[PDB]
Amino acid sequence: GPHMATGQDRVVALVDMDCFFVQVEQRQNPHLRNKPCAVVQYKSWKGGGIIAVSYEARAFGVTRSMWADDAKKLCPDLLLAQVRESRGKANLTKYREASVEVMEIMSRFAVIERASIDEAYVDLTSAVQERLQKLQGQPISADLLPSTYIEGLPQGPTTVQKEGMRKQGLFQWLDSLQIDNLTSPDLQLTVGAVIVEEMRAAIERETGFQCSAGISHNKVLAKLACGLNKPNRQTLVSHGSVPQLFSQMPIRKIRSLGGKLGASVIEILGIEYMGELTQFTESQLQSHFGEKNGSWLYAMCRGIEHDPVKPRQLPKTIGCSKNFPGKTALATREQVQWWLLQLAQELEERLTKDRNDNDRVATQLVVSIRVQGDKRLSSLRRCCALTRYDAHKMSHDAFTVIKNCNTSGIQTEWSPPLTMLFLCATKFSAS
DNA sequence: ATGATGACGCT
DNA sequence: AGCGTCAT
Ligand SMILES: Nc1ccn([C@H]2C[C@H](O)[C@@H](COP(=O)(O)NP(=O)(O)OP(=O)(O)O)O2)c(=O)n1
Ligand SMILES: [Mg+2]
Ligand SMILES: [Mg+2]
């Protein structure tokens, strides 16, 4: 009772951009706005691979990883924007620059953890404390929360349209809120949501991009919350909402459980939903999934997680990769060297920009290859020192550390053919 | 023949 | 170090 911690100590948000690469392209080209639209890479293979899809196009069943030629079968009027190509490969600079626009705005409000090119976690615990004091003790108006859903509401005795349902739940929540108690976790979450409304308003005003967000007590619930009412809405998931929410929540939807661990939780325990984990002891879970995973699952199915919002706005690595599928797998030494040089040249440009922008230098170069006949992301990784931002030196060094994989007795030929090259700059130091 | 990335755990 | 998982 009095000593059972409830994981309600923090206010955490996750802000995720809506159909992000599409919005970047729609801002640039007004002809694409409010249309079924997708972003594709490499136009020559079946129209290009789709990597982002507007919500209008999603309505036709267009999805990521679809070939554009196939997407056009579902959506004849689908509009497309192509990823830039430079040095023979996709170049994602435009989307990285747009990401920086958004991350810099979020950073005005609180220290963020950059979690992907289009999302960040926010620890709003301190900002909420400050706002509660500035608030005399006055009630929180629904007008301060114009795009907020309260997960689980409305409920109970006694509209058929979306916005009507959103307001009814919000009214139930606010009507029941105690504002007298500055330490109520529900009150803290509500103030957190007010601040996220302000943050999302700033992002849209200053960039033109819309986003969604989740507000909860930890990263996993905030991430889950964010997706519940996409696009262009934010969702508050209270501690109290967790038992019903998890009662029918497939295990694979919780971050980190979407892969083999999640599958084994399902198979080994014979369950389907996150809430069903509560039936097991902490020791039982640890026996099946290990000390760390066991403890994490035991707490997480109760809505509790302690993973901190890390103070990190910048990527820890900078890398360049290219696949060479099927018949195009690299089979000559000079092929391998030309492409390593292409990669190294992009990497040099990004590293030099990074060193000017962020006062740091990378010190290790990691070279990864995939071999024809494998299936793994990487077949092989080798590292060496990164001592100069020079593409010719980097590409020469990368060849040095991988050139012995070449089983071919003939020196001009490469065997077995390479289906992927990857260069990654790592181990940054202040500069 | 998704592809281009990026974080972090394990031994 | 180098490999494996999970992720957008
Ligand atoms: N497998 C993936 C997933 C995302 N991305 C890129 C394109 C996406 O626009 C961007 C952000 O990914 P995302 O947040 O998962 N989805 P996106 O923002 O496009 O749509 P939402 O569902 O978030 O509204 O990363 C990618 O290149 N490969
Ligand atoms: Mg997104
Ligand atoms: Mg995202």
Q: What is the 3-state secondary structure (H, E, C) of A344-379?
A: HHHHHHHHHHHHHHHCEEEEEEEEEEEECCCCCCCC
Q: Where are the beta strands (DSSP E) in A217-329?
A: 234-236, 318-323
Q: How far is CA A118 from CA A7, A17, A180, A211, A382, in A?
A: 27, 5, 37, 9, 30
CA–CA separation, A211 and A297 (whole Å): 29
Tokens of A395: 């590409």
CA–CA separation, A121 and A124 (whole Å): 9
- The structure tokens 């369950």 sit at A271
CA–CA separation, A32 and A372 (whole Å): 39
Tokens of A87: 């040095």
CA–CA separation, A129 and A135 (whole Å): 10
Confirm if A265 and A297 have CB atoms less than 8 A apart: yes
Cis? peptide before A30, omega within 30° of 0: no
Tokens of A325: 């599928």
CA–CA separation, A354 and A358 (whole Å): 6
- From the CA of A207 to the C1' of C3: give the distance in Å: 40
Q: Is A119 annotated as a binding residue?
A: yes
Judge whether residue A142 contacts strand C, using its CB and a 7 Å cut-off: no
* Best CA proximity match to A147, nearest among A58, A236, A24: A236
Query: Residues 159-218 of A near strand B (Cβ < 7 Å)?
Result: none
A19-88: in CATH 3.40.1170.60: yes
Tokens of A133: 């004091």
Data resolution in angstroms? 1.7
- From the CA of A379 to the C1' of C3: give the distance in Å: 9
Amino acid found at A182: L
* Best CA proximity match to A351, nearest among A320, A397, A311, A396: A320
Judge whether residue A382 contacts strand C, using its CB and a 7 Å cut-off: yes
Q: Is A17 annotated as a binding residue?
A: yes
- For residue A230, report the distance from its CA to the centre of ligand 2, in Å: 9
- DSSP letters for A108-128: HHS-EEEEETTEEEEE-HHHH
Reported as type and span, the H/E element at residue A419 is: strand A413-430
Report CA dihedral (A348, A354, A356, A362) to the nearest 10 degrees.
-70
DSSP A59: T
In sign, the C-alpha dihedral spanning A366, A370, A374, A380 is negative
Judge whether residue A90 contacts strand B, using its CB and a 7 Å cut-off: yes
Q: Percent helix, strand, coil in chain A (nearest 5)?
A: 45, 20, 35
- The structure tokens 């409304």 sit at A197
The number of beta carbons lying within 10 Å of the beta carbon of residue A363 is 13
- From the CA of A196 to the C1' of B9: give the distance in Å: 32
Tell me the nt nearest to A368, Cα to C1'.
Answer: C2
Helices (H), A110-237: 125-134, 162-176, 185-207, 219-228
Reported as type and span, the H/E element at residue A86 is: strand A85-86
- For residue A211, report the distance from its CA to the centre of ligand 1, in Å: 12
CA–CA separation, A89 and A74 (whole Å): 28
β partners of residue A113: A121, A312
Confirm if A380 and A371 have CB atoms less than 8 A apart: yes
Query: Residues 103-122 of A near strand C (Cβ < 7 Å)?
Result: 115-119
- For residue A324, report the distance from its CA to the centre of ligand 2, in Å: 28
Q: Which CATH superfamily, name and number, covers A1-18+89-250?
A: Reverse transcriptase/Diguanylate cyclase domain (3.30.70.270)
CA–CA separation, A111 and A336 (whole Å): 42
Query: Residues 345-404 of A near strand B (Cβ < 7 Å)?
Result: 346, 377
Confirm if A8 and A186 have CB atoms less than 8 A apart: no
- For residue A259, report the distance from its CA to the centre of ligand 2, in Å: 20
φ, ψ of residue A106 in degrees (nearest 5): -60, -35
CA–CA separation, A384 and A400 (whole Å): 9
Q: Which CATH superfamily, name and number, covers A309-431?
A: DNA polymerase, Y-family, little finger domain (3.30.1490.100)
Q: Where are the domains of chain A?
A: 1-18+89-250, 19-88, 251-308, 309-431
Confirm if A424 and A317 have CB atoms less than 8 A apart: yes
β partners of residue A413: A332
Q: Which atom of ligand 1 is nearest to the CA of A18?
A: 24
Judge whether residue A258 contacts strand B, using its CB and a 7 Å cut-off: no
The three-point CA angle A319-A323-A326 to 5° equals: 170
Antiparallel, parallel or unpaired: β A89-90 and A85-86 = antiparallel
Q: Is A118 annotated as a binding residue?
A: yes
> Which structural technique was applied?
X-ray
Q: Is A16 annotated as a binding residue?
A: yes
Tokens of A139: 């009630």
Q: How far is CA A165 from CA A123, A151, A236, A379, in A?
A: 29, 11, 15, 51
**b/e code A56-73 from CB counts within 10 Å (16+ = b):** bbbebebeeebebeebbe
Nearest Cα residue to atom 17 of ligand 1: A19
CA–CA separation, A30 and A22 (whole Å): 12
Amino acid found at A129: Q
- The structure tokens 């958004």 sit at A102
**A38: buried, middle or exposed (CB in 10 Å: 19+, 13-18, 0-12)?**
buried
Reported as type and span, the H/E element at residue A414 is: strand A413-430
* Best CA proximity match to A231, nearest among A15, A24, A51: A15
CA–CA separation, A181 and A178 (whole Å): 6
Antiparallel, parallel or unpaired: β A413-430 and A360-371 = antiparallel
A146 lines ligand 1 (CB under 6 A): no
Mutate to test the pocket of ligand 1, among A24, A41, A51, A119 (most ligand atoms within 8 A of CB): A51
Tell me the nt nearest to A366, Cα to C1'.
Answer: C2
Tell me the nt nearest to A119, Cα to C1'.
Answer: C8
**b/e code A102-124 from CB counts within 10 Å (16+ = b):** bbebbeebbbbbbbebbbbbbbb
- For residue A231, report the distance from its CA to the centre of ligand 2, in Å: 9
Judge whether residue A89 contacts strand B, using its CB and a 7 Å cut-off: yes
Residue nearest to nucleotide C2 (CA to C1'): A381
CA–CA separation, A340 and A394 (whole Å): 9
Q: Under CATH, what is the fold of the domain A251-308? A: DNA polymerase; domain 1 (1.10.150)
Q: What is the largest CA-CA distance in chain A?
A: 80
As a whole number of Å, the end-to-end CA separation of chain A is 52
Q: Is A166 annotated as a binding residue?
A: no
Tokens of A143: 């007008």
A213 lines ligand 1 (CB under 6 A): no
CA–CA separation, A269 and A303 (whole Å): 19
